[PDB]
Short mmCIF file of C-alpha atoms in Angstrom, two decimals:
data_model
loop_
_atom_site.label_atom_id
_atom_site.label_comp_id
_atom_site.label_asym_id
_atom_site.label_seq_id
_atom_site.Cartn_x
_atom_site.Cartn_y
_atom_site.Cartn_z
CA UNK A 1 0.20 0.02 -0.06
CA UNK A 2 3.35 2.20 -0.45
CA UNK A 3 1.83 5.01 -2.60
CA UNK A 4 4.22 8.25 -3.57
CA UNK A 5 5.19 10.60 -6.20
CA UNK A 6 5.98 13.95 -6.68
CA UNK A 7 4.48 16.38 -9.03
CA UNK A 8 6.14 19.80 -10.54
CA UNK A 9 4.37 21.96 -12.62
CA UNK A 10 6.73 24.30 -14.51
CA UNK A 11 8.82 21.36 -16.03
CA UNK A 12 5.90 20.43 -17.98
CA UNK A 13 3.07 22.79 -18.87
CA UNK A 14 0.54 20.12 -20.22
CA UNK A 15 0.50 17.31 -17.75
CA UNK A 16 -0.67 19.68 -14.96
CA UNK A 17 -3.24 21.13 -17.20
CA UNK A 18 -4.56 17.36 -17.88
CA UNK A 19 -4.25 16.81 -14.15
CA UNK A 20 -6.36 19.62 -13.34
CA UNK A 21 -8.81 18.98 -15.97
CA UNK A 22 -9.81 15.86 -14.13
CA UNK A 23 -9.64 16.99 -10.73
CA UNK A 24 -12.19 19.97 -11.87
CA UNK A 25 -14.43 17.99 -13.82
CA UNK A 26 -14.68 14.95 -11.36
CA UNK A 27 -15.79 17.62 -8.60
CA UNK A 28 -18.18 19.28 -10.82
CA UNK A 29 -19.34 15.90 -11.80
CA UNK A 30 -20.67 14.43 -8.50
CA UNK A 31 -19.12 14.21 -4.79
CA UNK A 32 -15.72 12.30 -3.96
CA UNK A 33 -13.72 10.04 -6.48
CA UNK A 34 -11.77 7.06 -7.19
CA UNK A 35 -8.15 7.15 -7.95
CA UNK A 36 -6.98 3.77 -9.93
CA UNK A 37 -3.05 4.18 -9.07
CA UNK A 38 -1.79 0.80 -11.43
CA UNK A 39 1.62 0.15 -11.84
CA UNK A 40 1.70 2.13 -15.04
CA UNK A 41 -1.49 4.23 -15.84
CA UNK A 42 -3.40 6.50 -13.13
CA UNK A 43 -7.14 5.78 -13.49
CA UNK A 44 -9.62 8.62 -12.43
CA UNK A 45 -12.48 7.19 -12.18
CA UNK A 46 -16.41 9.24 -11.40
CA UNK A 47 -19.06 6.43 -11.54
CA UNK A 48 -22.54 6.46 -10.10
CA UNK A 49 -22.61 2.46 -9.99
CA UNK A 50 -19.77 2.62 -7.30
CA UNK A 51 -17.51 5.06 -5.92
CA UNK A 52 -18.80 3.25 -2.25
CA UNK A 53 -19.72 6.40 -0.58
CA UNK A 54 -20.54 8.44 -4.03
CA UNK A 55 -23.35 5.85 -4.67
CA UNK A 56 -26.00 7.17 -2.21
CA UNK A 57 -28.83 8.63 -4.37
CA UNK A 58 -27.43 8.95 -7.94
CA UNK A 59 -28.96 7.09 -10.74
CA UNK A 60 -32.18 7.21 -8.02
CA UNK A 61 -33.41 10.79 -7.60
CA UNK A 62 -31.49 13.04 -10.36
CA UNK A 63 -30.60 10.81 -13.49
CA UNK A 64 -27.40 11.20 -12.80
CA UNK A 65 -25.76 8.38 -14.74
CA UNK A 66 -22.72 9.91 -16.43
CA UNK A 67 -19.53 7.99 -15.88
CA UNK A 68 -16.07 9.53 -16.74
CA UNK A 69 -13.14 7.39 -16.81
CA UNK A 70 -9.81 9.24 -17.44
CA UNK A 71 -6.21 8.13 -17.63
CA UNK A 72 -3.20 9.66 -16.99
CA UNK A 73 0.23 7.73 -17.83
CA UNK A 74 3.11 7.05 -14.96
CA UNK A 75 5.42 9.76 -17.28
CA UNK A 76 3.03 12.83 -16.01
CA UNK A 77 4.39 12.57 -12.24
CA UNK A 78 8.25 12.93 -11.54
CA UNK A 79 8.41 9.55 -9.20
CA UNK A 80 5.94 6.78 -10.04
CA UNK A 81 6.69 4.10 -7.29
CA UNK A 82 3.51 1.90 -6.55
CA UNK A 83 3.79 -1.16 -3.67
CA UNK A 84 1.32 -3.26 -3.42
CA UNK A 85 0.27 -6.67 -3.03
CA UNK A 86 -2.82 -6.44 -5.29
CA UNK A 87 -2.52 -7.10 -9.21
CA UNK A 88 -0.45 -4.90 -10.87
CA UNK A 89 -0.08 -3.31 -7.48
CA UNK A 90 -3.46 -1.72 -8.00
CA UNK A 91 -4.03 0.79 -5.25
CA UNK A 92 -7.97 1.78 -5.74
CA UNK A 93 -8.91 4.60 -3.02
CA UNK A 94 -11.89 6.96 -2.68
CA UNK A 95 -11.57 10.53 -1.32
CA UNK A 96 -13.53 14.14 -1.22
CA UNK A 97 -13.33 15.96 -4.41
CA UNK A 98 -13.76 19.34 -2.10
CA UNK A 99 -10.04 18.89 -0.02
CA UNK A 100 -8.32 17.58 -2.88
CA UNK A 101 -9.55 20.75 -5.32
CA UNK A 102 -9.18 22.82 -2.53
CA UNK A 103 -5.22 21.72 -2.22
CA UNK A 104 -4.97 22.08 -5.79
CA UNK A 105 -6.26 25.46 -5.92
CA UNK A 106 -3.61 26.64 -3.25
CA UNK A 107 -0.99 24.83 -4.95
CA UNK A 108 -2.10 26.55 -8.16
CA UNK A 109 -2.35 29.91 -6.50
CA UNK A 110 1.33 29.31 -4.85
CA UNK A 111 2.94 28.69 -8.24
CA UNK A 112 1.40 31.88 -9.53
CA UNK A 113 2.84 33.77 -6.86
CA UNK A 114 6.47 32.96 -8.06
CA UNK A 115 7.25 29.45 -7.15
CA UNK A 116 9.38 26.52 -7.96
CA UNK A 117 8.47 24.08 -4.69
CA UNK A 118 7.22 20.69 -6.10
CA UNK A 119 4.52 18.93 -4.00
CA UNK A 120 4.71 15.66 -2.28
CA UNK A 121 1.89 13.11 -2.27
CA UNK A 122 2.00 10.17 -0.08
CA UNK A 123 0.13 7.88 1.55
CA UNK A 124 0.73 8.10 5.63
CA UNK A 125 -1.14 4.25 6.49
CA UNK A 152 -9.11 0.44 5.20
CA UNK A 153 -9.09 4.03 5.74
CA UNK A 154 -6.07 5.96 5.42
CA UNK A 155 -4.48 9.91 4.56
CA UNK A 156 -3.17 11.63 1.96
CA UNK A 157 0.28 13.64 3.29
CA UNK A 158 0.36 16.32 0.37
CA UNK A 159 3.01 18.52 1.67
CA UNK A 160 4.75 21.65 -0.45
CA UNK A 161 6.02 25.27 0.13
CA UNK A 162 6.64 28.84 -0.81
CA UNK A 163 9.75 30.07 -2.11
CA UNK A 200 10.09 28.17 3.94
CA UNK A 201 6.18 28.19 4.74
CA UNK A 202 5.12 24.57 5.35
CA UNK A 203 1.66 23.64 4.16
CA UNK A 204 0.64 20.17 5.42
CA UNK A 205 -2.86 18.65 4.19
CA UNK A 206 -4.12 15.41 5.22
CA UNK A 207 -6.75 14.84 3.27
CA UNK A 208 -8.87 11.39 4.41
CA UNK A 209 -8.87 8.87 1.94
CA UNK A 210 -9.77 4.76 2.19
CA UNK A 211 -8.74 1.65 0.68
CA UNK A 212 -11.68 0.42 -1.51
CA UNK A 213 -11.35 -3.40 -2.07
CA UNK A 214 -9.90 -5.33 -4.85
CA UNK A 215 -13.58 -7.26 -5.21
CA UNK A 216 -15.24 -3.99 -4.99
CA UNK A 217 -12.33 -2.44 -7.51
CA UNK A 218 -13.43 -5.22 -10.16
CA UNK A 219 -16.78 -4.03 -9.71
CA UNK A 220 -15.91 -0.99 -11.36
CA UNK A 221 -15.36 -1.81 -15.01
CA UNK A 222 -15.64 0.49 -18.17
CA UNK A 223 -18.89 0.74 -20.12
CA UNK A 224 -18.26 -0.92 -23.59
CA UNK A 225 -19.22 0.79 -26.33
CA UNK A 226 -20.64 -0.79 -29.50
CA UNK A 227 -19.51 0.44 -33.07
CA UNK A 228 -21.85 -0.86 -35.37
CA UNK A 229 -24.07 2.47 -35.49
CA UNK A 230 -21.77 5.06 -33.84
CA UNK A 231 -20.06 7.82 -36.02
CA UNK A 232 -17.37 10.00 -34.69
CA UNK A 233 -16.86 13.52 -34.98
CA UNK A 234 -13.44 15.35 -34.70
CA UNK A 235 -14.41 18.38 -32.75
CA UNK A 236 -11.79 21.33 -34.05
CA UNK A 237 -9.13 22.34 -32.07
CA UNK A 238 -9.73 25.33 -29.90
CA UNK A 239 -6.70 27.11 -30.85
CA UNK A 240 -7.65 26.93 -34.31
CA UNK A 241 -9.69 29.44 -36.06
CA UNK A 242 -13.06 27.57 -36.07
CA UNK A 243 -12.38 26.86 -32.65
CA UNK A 244 -13.70 29.57 -30.67
CA UNK A 245 -16.83 29.75 -33.02
CA UNK A 246 -17.55 25.65 -32.39
CA UNK A 247 -16.91 26.83 -28.64
CA UNK A 248 -19.52 29.26 -28.97
CA UNK A 249 -21.85 27.10 -30.58
CA UNK A 250 -21.52 24.36 -27.98
CA UNK A 251 -22.43 27.03 -25.21
CA UNK A 252 -24.92 28.77 -27.47
CA UNK A 253 -27.73 26.61 -25.65
CA UNK A 254 -26.74 27.76 -22.62
CA UNK A 255 -28.60 31.27 -22.96
CA UNK A 256 -31.95 29.62 -22.69
CA UNK A 257 -32.82 29.05 -19.01
CA UNK A 258 -35.34 26.74 -19.36
CA UNK A 259 -34.03 24.05 -21.78
CA UNK A 260 -32.94 20.46 -19.70
CA UNK A 261 -32.49 17.85 -22.79
CA UNK A 262 -30.65 18.55 -26.04
CA UNK A 263 -31.61 16.70 -29.08
CA UNK A 264 -28.21 16.04 -30.90
CA UNK A 265 -28.00 15.02 -34.30
CA UNK A 266 -25.67 14.37 -37.11
CA UNK A 267 -26.34 13.86 -41.03
CA UNK A 268 -23.44 12.16 -43.07
CA UNK A 278 -18.77 16.15 -44.77
CA UNK A 279 -20.84 15.74 -41.59
CA UNK A 280 -23.50 18.32 -40.29
CA UNK A 281 -23.42 18.38 -36.62
CA UNK A 282 -27.08 19.75 -35.25
CA UNK A 283 -28.83 20.79 -31.94
CA UNK A 284 -32.17 20.59 -31.48
CA UNK A 285 -34.31 22.31 -28.68
CA UNK A 286 -38.33 21.33 -28.51
CA UNK A 287 -38.68 22.39 -24.97
CA UNK A 288 -39.64 25.81 -26.02
CA UNK A 289 -42.75 27.68 -27.57
CA UNK A 290 -40.96 27.79 -30.97
CA UNK A 291 -39.09 24.90 -32.58
CA UNK A 292 -35.27 25.86 -32.48
CA UNK A 293 -32.68 24.05 -34.34
CA UNK A 294 -28.81 25.27 -33.31
CA UNK A 295 -26.99 24.35 -36.45
CA UNK A 296 -23.13 24.39 -37.72
CA UNK A 297 -22.27 25.44 -40.97
CA UNK A 298 -18.43 25.35 -40.34
CA UNK A 299 -15.99 22.29 -41.41
CA UNK A 300 -16.27 19.10 -39.36
CA UNK A 301 -14.35 16.09 -39.45
CA UNK A 302 -15.74 12.53 -39.18
CA UNK A 303 -12.93 10.19 -38.29
CA UNK A 304 -14.46 6.63 -39.06
CA UNK A 404 -27.71 8.01 -42.04
CA UNK A 405 -28.78 10.51 -39.07
CA UNK A 406 -27.48 9.51 -35.10
CA UNK A 407 -29.45 11.14 -32.71
CA UNK A 408 -29.22 10.95 -28.75
CA UNK A 409 -31.22 13.27 -25.96
CA UNK A 410 -28.96 13.99 -23.48
CA UNK A 411 -29.26 16.81 -20.51
CA UNK A 412 -27.96 20.27 -20.30
CA UNK A 413 -25.40 20.22 -17.46
CA UNK A 414 -23.87 16.63 -19.67
CA UNK A 415 -23.62 19.11 -22.26
CA UNK A 416 -21.86 22.06 -20.10
CA UNK A 417 -19.38 19.66 -18.99
CA UNK A 418 -18.22 18.84 -22.64
CA UNK A 419 -18.30 22.51 -23.23
CA UNK A 420 -15.59 22.69 -20.27
CA UNK A 421 -13.75 19.72 -21.68
CA UNK A 422 -13.43 20.95 -25.55
CA UNK A 423 -12.31 24.23 -23.60
CA UNK A 424 -9.63 22.13 -22.15
CA UNK A 425 -8.22 20.19 -24.94
CA UNK A 426 -7.63 20.10 -28.69
CA UNK A 427 -8.15 16.14 -29.89
CA UNK A 428 -12.09 16.11 -28.93
CA UNK A 429 -14.21 13.40 -30.69
CA UNK A 430 -17.87 13.54 -30.38
CA UNK A 431 -19.22 9.92 -30.04
CA UNK A 432 -22.86 9.44 -31.01
CA UNK A 433 -24.81 6.35 -30.47
CA UNK A 434 -28.27 6.23 -32.03
CA UNK A 435 -30.68 6.39 -29.03
CA UNK A 436 -28.24 4.88 -26.79
CA UNK A 437 -25.49 7.08 -25.55
CA UNK A 438 -23.07 9.71 -26.49
CA UNK A 439 -19.32 9.95 -25.56
CA UNK A 440 -16.99 12.77 -25.33
CA UNK A 441 -13.42 11.35 -26.09
CA UNK A 442 -10.86 14.08 -25.18
CA UNK A 443 -7.14 13.42 -25.31
CA UNK A 444 -4.03 15.14 -24.81
CA UNK A 445 -0.90 13.88 -26.92
CA UNK A 446 1.79 14.84 -25.24
CA UNK A 447 4.61 13.21 -26.90
CA UNK A 460 1.43 7.85 -23.49
CA UNK A 461 -1.61 9.85 -24.09
CA UNK A 462 -4.24 11.08 -21.46
CA UNK A 463 -7.30 10.14 -22.83
CA UNK A 464 -10.47 11.72 -21.06
CA UNK A 465 -13.52 9.68 -21.48
CA UNK A 466 -16.94 10.87 -20.69
CA UNK A 467 -19.97 8.42 -21.20
CA UNK A 468 -23.46 9.85 -21.31
CA UNK A 469 -26.65 7.96 -21.55
CA UNK A 470 -29.98 8.80 -23.34
CA UNK A 471 -32.34 10.96 -20.90
CA UNK A 472 -35.46 10.41 -23.19
CA UNK A 473 -36.36 8.33 -26.43
CA UNK A 474 -36.25 9.85 -30.12
CA UNK B 9 -40.39 27.22 -50.17
CA UNK B 10 -43.42 29.55 -51.48
CA UNK B 11 -41.79 32.65 -49.96
CA UNK B 12 -38.37 33.36 -49.34
CA UNK B 13 -36.74 36.68 -47.90
CA UNK B 14 -33.02 37.39 -47.39
CA UNK B 15 -31.51 40.63 -45.49
CA UNK B 16 -28.28 41.75 -43.65
CA UNK B 17 -29.97 45.02 -42.42
CA UNK B 18 -31.89 43.44 -39.47
CA UNK B 19 -31.85 46.95 -37.56
CA UNK B 20 -34.82 47.56 -40.38
CA UNK B 21 -36.57 44.50 -39.16
CA UNK B 22 -36.00 44.90 -35.29
CA UNK B 23 -37.28 48.64 -35.53
CA UNK B 24 -40.51 47.51 -37.31
CA UNK B 25 -40.74 44.53 -34.63
CA UNK B 26 -40.33 47.88 -32.12
CA UNK B 27 -43.08 49.62 -33.86
CA UNK B 28 -45.25 46.85 -33.11
CA UNK B 29 -45.03 46.07 -29.50
CA UNK B 30 -47.25 49.29 -28.74
CA UNK B 31 -50.17 47.69 -30.04
CA UNK B 32 -50.34 44.75 -27.25
CA UNK B 33 -47.52 43.03 -26.09
CA UNK B 34 -48.84 39.39 -26.28
CA UNK B 35 -51.28 38.63 -28.73
CA UNK B 36 -51.77 37.36 -32.78
CA UNK B 37 -49.69 39.38 -35.52
CA UNK B 38 -50.87 39.02 -39.06
CA UNK B 39 -48.47 38.56 -41.65
CA UNK B 40 -49.48 39.52 -45.47
CA UNK B 41 -47.51 38.09 -48.28
CA UNK B 42 -47.59 39.32 -51.69
CA UNK B 43 -44.87 39.97 -54.33
CA UNK B 44 -44.52 43.67 -53.39
CA UNK B 45 -43.60 43.34 -50.15
CA UNK B 46 -44.28 42.13 -46.35
CA UNK B 47 -46.34 43.78 -44.14
CA UNK B 48 -47.02 43.00 -40.73
CA UNK B 49 -50.84 44.40 -39.23
CA UNK B 50 -52.15 44.28 -35.87
CA UNK B 51 -55.55 45.23 -34.17
CA UNK B 52 -56.27 46.15 -30.95
CA UNK B 53 -59.90 46.11 -29.24
CA UNK B 54 -61.37 46.75 -32.90
CA UNK B 55 -60.52 50.57 -32.58
CA UNK B 56 -57.17 50.72 -33.69
CA UNK B 57 -55.36 49.25 -36.17
CA UNK B 58 -51.08 49.45 -37.32
CA UNK B 59 -49.86 48.53 -40.83
CA UNK B 60 -46.08 48.32 -41.02
CA UNK B 61 -44.88 47.27 -44.95
CA UNK B 62 -40.85 45.92 -45.42
CA UNK B 63 -40.69 46.10 -49.22
CA UNK B 64 -38.96 43.71 -51.89
CA UNK B 65 -36.10 46.37 -52.31
CA UNK B 66 -35.24 45.89 -48.47
CA UNK B 67 -34.35 42.35 -49.38
CA UNK B 68 -31.81 41.20 -51.59
CA UNK B 69 -34.11 38.03 -52.60
CA UNK B 70 -37.61 38.32 -52.44
CA UNK B 71 -39.09 34.96 -54.46
CA UNK B 72 -42.39 34.64 -53.63
CA UNK B 73 -42.97 31.32 -55.58
CA UNK B 74 -46.61 31.06 -54.72
CA UNK B 75 -48.75 31.10 -58.27
CA UNK B 76 -52.35 29.86 -56.65
CA UNK B 77 -52.84 32.48 -54.76
CA UNK B 78 -51.83 36.31 -54.99
CA UNK B 79 -51.50 37.19 -51.19
CA UNK B 80 -50.60 34.63 -48.48
CA UNK B 81 -51.93 35.34 -44.96
CA UNK B 82 -50.65 33.73 -41.79
CA UNK B 83 -51.45 34.56 -38.29
CA UNK B 84 -48.51 33.97 -35.32
CA UNK B 85 -47.84 35.04 -31.41
CA UNK B 86 -45.94 38.33 -31.23
CA UNK B 87 -44.78 36.97 -27.90
CA UNK B 88 -43.23 34.06 -29.26
CA UNK B 89 -41.20 36.49 -32.00
CA UNK B 90 -40.20 38.97 -29.02
CA UNK B 91 -39.21 36.61 -26.74
CA UNK B 92 -37.04 34.31 -29.74
CA UNK B 93 -35.54 37.61 -31.50
CA UNK B 94 -34.36 38.81 -28.11
CA UNK B 95 -31.68 36.18 -27.17
CA UNK B 96 -31.33 36.16 -30.82
CA UNK B 97 -29.68 39.58 -30.62
CA UNK B 98 -27.22 38.91 -27.86
CA UNK B 99 -24.63 39.26 -30.15
CA UNK B 100 -26.24 41.35 -32.92
CA UNK B 101 -22.79 42.78 -33.80
CA UNK B 102 -22.01 39.76 -35.95
CA UNK B 103 -22.62 39.99 -39.42
CA UNK B 104 -26.24 37.93 -39.18
CA UNK B 105 -28.36 37.43 -42.47
CA UNK B 106 -32.11 36.91 -41.67
CA UNK B 107 -33.80 34.38 -43.82
CA UNK B 108 -37.76 34.56 -44.01
CA UNK B 109 -39.82 31.63 -44.97
CA UNK B 110 -42.76 30.37 -45.48
CA UNK B 111 -44.13 27.11 -47.26
CA UNK B 112 -47.72 27.61 -46.98
CA UNK B 113 -51.12 26.83 -44.77
CA UNK B 114 -49.73 24.55 -42.02
CA UNK B 115 -46.09 25.05 -42.16
CA UNK B 116 -44.38 27.61 -39.86
CA UNK B 117 -42.55 30.88 -40.38
CA UNK B 118 -39.14 30.15 -40.40
CA UNK B 119 -36.67 32.59 -39.17
CA UNK B 120 -32.77 31.75 -39.79
CA UNK B 121 -29.93 33.40 -38.25
CA UNK B 122 -26.80 32.54 -39.65
CA UNK B 123 -23.48 33.90 -38.72
CA UNK B 124 -21.33 31.71 -41.01
CA UNK B 125 -20.34 29.25 -37.90
CA UNK B 126 -23.96 29.17 -36.65
CA UNK B 127 -27.37 28.74 -38.40
CA UNK B 128 -30.22 29.16 -35.77
CA UNK B 129 -33.37 28.11 -37.35
CA UNK B 130 -36.61 29.25 -35.47
CA UNK B 131 -40.09 27.85 -36.88
CA UNK B 132 -43.08 29.79 -35.32
CA UNK B 133 -46.41 28.12 -35.20
CA UNK B 134 -48.85 29.69 -37.46
CA UNK B 135 -52.65 29.84 -35.95
CA UNK B 136 -56.00 30.21 -37.62
CA UNK B 137 -57.06 33.90 -38.22
CA UNK B 138 -59.74 35.63 -36.53
CA UNK B 139 -62.85 37.39 -37.75
CA UNK B 140 -62.33 40.49 -37.94
CA UNK B 141 -61.15 42.22 -41.15
CA UNK B 142 -58.22 44.91 -41.26
CA UNK B 143 -59.96 46.47 -44.33
CA UNK B 144 -62.96 47.94 -41.78
CA UNK B 145 -60.52 50.16 -39.84
CA UNK B 146 -59.60 52.32 -42.86
CA UNK B 147 -60.29 56.04 -43.83
CA UNK B 148 -62.92 56.94 -46.69
CA UNK B 149 -60.59 58.34 -49.22
CA UNK B 150 -63.36 60.82 -50.40
CA UNK B 151 -64.24 62.21 -47.39
CA UNK B 152 -61.29 63.96 -45.50
CA UNK B 153 -61.78 66.70 -43.59
CA UNK B 154 -58.13 67.85 -42.77
CA UNK B 155 -54.99 66.91 -44.05
CA UNK B 156 -51.77 67.75 -42.18
CA UNK B 157 -47.81 67.10 -42.99
CA UNK B 158 -45.93 67.22 -39.49
CA UNK B 159 -42.50 66.37 -38.94
CA UNK B 160 -41.66 63.56 -36.92
CA UNK B 161 -39.39 65.23 -34.16
CA UNK B 162 -42.21 67.60 -33.08
CA UNK B 163 -44.97 65.39 -33.09
CA UNK B 164 -42.87 62.88 -31.03
CA UNK B 165 -41.96 65.74 -28.95
CA UNK B 166 -45.76 66.60 -28.28
CA UNK B 167 -46.32 63.22 -27.79
CA UNK B 168 -43.84 62.66 -24.92
CA UNK B 169 -45.25 66.13 -23.28
CA UNK B 170 -48.63 64.56 -23.53
CA UNK B 171 -47.29 61.39 -21.77
CA UNK B 172 -45.98 63.25 -19.31
CA UNK B 173 -48.69 65.40 -18.37
CA UNK B 174 -50.76 62.03 -18.37
CA UNK B 175 -53.75 62.86 -20.81
CA UNK B 176 -56.24 60.94 -20.10
CA UNK B 177 -58.35 62.12 -23.32
CA UNK B 178 -56.87 64.03 -26.25
CA UNK B 179 -58.20 66.54 -28.43
CA UNK B 180 -56.92 67.57 -32.56
CA UNK B 181 -57.81 71.50 -33.66
CA UNK B 182 -57.30 71.86 -37.18
CA UNK B 183 -58.22 75.16 -38.77
CA UNK B 184 -57.02 76.99 -42.08
CA UNK B 185 -57.28 80.93 -41.42
CA UNK B 186 -58.06 82.88 -44.59
CA UNK B 187 -55.09 85.03 -44.64
CA UNK B 188 -52.29 82.84 -44.31
CA UNK B 189 -52.27 81.27 -40.96
CA UNK B 190 -52.77 77.23 -40.46
CA UNK B 191 -53.41 76.26 -36.83
CA UNK B 192 -52.80 72.79 -35.68
CA UNK B 193 -52.92 72.09 -32.08
CA UNK B 194 -53.17 68.89 -29.61
CA UNK B 195 -55.36 70.10 -26.66
CA UNK B 196 -55.23 67.56 -23.63
CA UNK B 197 -57.60 66.87 -20.81
CA UNK B 198 -55.39 65.55 -17.82
CA UNK B 199 -54.52 65.99 -14.11
CA UNK B 200 -53.50 69.47 -14.89
CA UNK B 201 -56.42 71.05 -16.54
#
């Protein structure tokens, strides 16, 4: 159960954003998180099907069925030492996102104050604590965030959803840094100026055309996109919620290689990636909120 | 489509809409489509009627491919249009090219706002047309008792003064003196006197 790692933001300016995007989007998603410290890939998991202390009333009174499955390579951190008796030294935990996110805000601000001090993350001994420690540039900051040691049998129950490809059509969203990126981000967040919209009817017709249809108003609104869209690889449509689209808006704003996967009346998958050079893929699985 | 009209000077169709709101803020507005232009007619309590007209010259393209009838009548709600074109106008500084469309009776009224990146499409439901006819509330063109041509600013200032003094009731005086004098006044009954 020996878990120790050190992160230094200044050396790599991309992996820190990669980690911050997960720590922010999981906190926005739901309370607490799972951190699967495998021997080579960190798998931060936010699922209502499990999480132990995040499986109270998820898909019960709010329709929260969203499952985010990220992946952090071992090369992100400075030292990646994992010691555990489990298979491939698997160390699955469950801690709240409030304290962890506040600590990361403090570390980021300490960086913004003009510091080069690193951060040390440990596991100071099935309930434990995380020994986050760092300094200014010699003021001491110690945060022993509570954490647990969710069992291997409980770990096995946490499996990534298996998305089929019989009817799936991918859509290569344009990079935000590109000319069409700002326009596409505005088109994505355009559905947010109507406070009475709860469901979004995505549509893709094959040069593919991406269309957003809103049918929860006195008028029939269709938010279209006439710009260039690439389909890495019939109309496939899925009705999803609005918060599930806001988090996708944030994920697109925080990444470049973003793929919008649409299953016909089954699911919508938002595949983000960061080609640092292996690749820190961020995958969000969103389920249909209504039938077509 | 039986009718299609495209424009970029959306401020014209925005001021035209802003001239219609005074005649009620939530009711039905009648749109008459013919080859000459697009007109909006609104009637309140059978005592007043307003008829704006947007000519075909205000649009680059004005097809009106309808051939079975010379004119097309549709009745839509004004609150849907006003509530719609408000949030559309959030980024009105963009080069927007409005596209009006109507495919006939039973088809909705389409209002496309394309920004060369986003093509917002709003379809307004068309309702049945009421019994009252807008040609009843027109002056007889062979019975005119007075014909006054006034500037816009002076009349606007006079109306704003009448509004500020309250003016529950109003009077219009029009006398032409023999020598050279023309008298036109807007007398008001109000709290003042």
